[PDB]
Amino acid sequence: GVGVRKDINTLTAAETTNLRDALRRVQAGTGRMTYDFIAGAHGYPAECKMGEYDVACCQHGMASFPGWHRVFTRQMEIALSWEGAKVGLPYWDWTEAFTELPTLVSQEHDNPFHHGHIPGKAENITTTRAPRPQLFKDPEHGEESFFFRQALLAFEQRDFCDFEVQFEVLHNALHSWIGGTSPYGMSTLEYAAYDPIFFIHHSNVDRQFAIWQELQKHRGLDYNTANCHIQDLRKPLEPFNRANNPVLVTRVHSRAIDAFNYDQYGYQYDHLHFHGLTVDKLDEKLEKRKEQDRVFLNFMLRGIKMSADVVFDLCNAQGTCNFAGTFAILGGPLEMPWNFDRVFKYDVTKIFQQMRLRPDSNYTIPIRIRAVNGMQLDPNLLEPPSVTFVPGK
């Protein structure tokens, strides 16, 4: 139990009550660490500097994102343990089909997981959620969950920095589509960590990282280190490196390169079976996907000082158009500027096949970009995608 992250759907009523009691104490600010102190490491109030400008400390849009958020998620989990939690932060596997948010977080009354207070505002100013409909309805009408298929393409990657782009962009969709137009909530960088669902999401995100590390181990590849962005992964994961961090284990292991070894931080998962597949069976499924000829769109992403949803259509030369996919960017005015150094890949094989289009056919791919407050943005904010054909192996 202690330090064990369980699937949220396996919690007992006693474990649920215990986690709620521990979070209530962390949010009350009377305990060893306060919810504000921890949540403030992520976005608002800006706790980092980029020269003279105050910026959010969370690392996004870069190879250090998984390690930064691994350490952050453990920091909150330790705060809960110090206030009596007997289990670790449960993970919600949102790659399984679901029709509503987990009851742990959706219960409105007597539930610390429902929302968080915004520091600096009156006590009744809290995070809210405004969930977007595609959170619950597969926008591609495909086989299994939209999020499952996106996760498989991430898990296919055999290099950490290639994995990381797929991984992080998938994780953005849950932020965007839980928070929606909420002024304070999951869909902005500034306030997302004040909603306790942040940490249920990031427990699952961290478990996906752990699953990919198991895949890399089984493949005979790097899983406790990486050979890309080598100096970047040695930078401090601010603010966890600072002397006022009361948690020894996160303060002393406060580089992304240290964060590959999650055991040393004192936690583990109940298991790492992805949809009840062992690691060898998962990798077998990934290898089978690679036997087919596929078409991908390739997007170059960068921070745009806001969060947004991108949608694209595939239109044949006669003007018949079908929805071809979607992804999200997480951000806000406090973001550290960023540009990925490689494409974000998006599988459009099925929609090309169904429209009887080859990659070298005549077609267009219209792009739309909408900020999470609902405002349409200029599609030219992002470079148009490129098209690749990948023959089956």
Ligand SMILES: *[C@@H]1O[C@H](CO[C@@H]2O[C@@H](C)[C@@H](O)[C@@H](O)[C@@H]2O)[C@@H](O[C@@H]2O[C@H](CO)[C@@H](O[C@@H]3O[C@H](CO[C@H]4O[C@H](CO)[C@@H](O)[C@H](O)[C@@H]4O[C@@H]4O[C@H](CO)[C@@H](O)[C@H](O)[C@H]4NC(C)=O)[C@@H](O)[C@H](O)[C@@H]3O)[C@H](O)[C@H]2NC(C)=O)[C@H](O)[C@H]1NC(C)=O
């Ligand atoms: C959500 O909670 C907020 C916050 O309310 C606070 O917390 C709750 C728990 C209670 O303790 C409240 O007493 C407390 O304020 C609620 O918003 C509050 O609602 C009440 C009732 O409508 C308002 O009362 C009115 O208050 C004004 C005076 O407001 C001045 O003084 C307040 C301190 O008493 C300050 O918070 C205000 O910012 C404001 O300060 C003024 O600043 C000007 C500068 O131009 C100067 O004149 C002075 O510096 C000062 N003026 C004064 C003191 O006259 C009063 O005139 C009026 O007659 C009412 O009594 C609260 O003002 C209001 N607070 C805020 C911050 O908006 C919401 O109602 C809650 N919402 C829900 C949905 O529940």
Ligand SMILES: *[C@@H]1O[C@H](CO)[C@@H](O)[C@H](O)[C@H]1NC(C)=O
């Ligand atoms: C694309 O359209 C042009 C005319 O606009 C035509 O000459 C060409 O054959 C078309 N290509 C395909 C692959 O249909």
Ligand code: CUO
């Ligand atoms: O939180 Cu900083 O990105 Cu999920």
Ligand SMILES: [Br-]
């Ligand atoms: Br709400």
Ligand SMILES: [Br-]
């Ligand atoms: Br580097």
